[PDB]
């Protein structure tokens, strides 16, 4: 039904507008496995991530047809939806590159 086109290691943060603080998505510090999933029937994409130790879902966010994906640093990327700002702090420069090009691909095919 739906395919994982990439798997990077990153710390998923969401932004706390109230306090100008980046907070760990899910409330708990640590790395997660972050996927970009492709629903082959619908041609729709979403970012899904489960923390490495707990297998708790810390992020599950649709990728819309025009998402502005900002690569702030070579290891920190961020994008915005109607509610939050999501950040991925990747474990490696390479993790970020493959995730970034899967994201850039997903936006071209949407």
């Amino acid at each position: 039904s739906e395919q994982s086109i990439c798997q990077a290691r990153a710390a998923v943060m969401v932004y706390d507008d109230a306090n100008k603080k980046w907070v760990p998505a899910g409330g708990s510090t640590g790395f997660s496995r972050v996927h970009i999933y492709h629903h082959t029937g619908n041609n729709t994409f979403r970012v899904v991530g489960r923390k490495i130790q707990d297998h708790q879902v810390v992020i599950n966010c649709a990728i819309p047809k025009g998402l502005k994906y900002n690569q702030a640093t070579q290891t920190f990327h961020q994008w915005r939806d109607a509610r939050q700002v999501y950040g991925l702090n990747f474990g490696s420069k390479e993790d970020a590159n493959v995730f970034a090009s899967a994201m850039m691909h997903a936006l071209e095919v949407l």
Binding site: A11, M13, Y15, K20, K21, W22, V23, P24, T29, N70, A72, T73, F76, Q78, V85, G87, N89
Partner: peptide, 10 residues
């Protein structure tokens, strides 16, 4: 865009 996080934040 918020600034990237302090390494103390992560």
């Amino acid at each position: 865009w918020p600034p990237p996080p302090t390494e103390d934040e992560l």
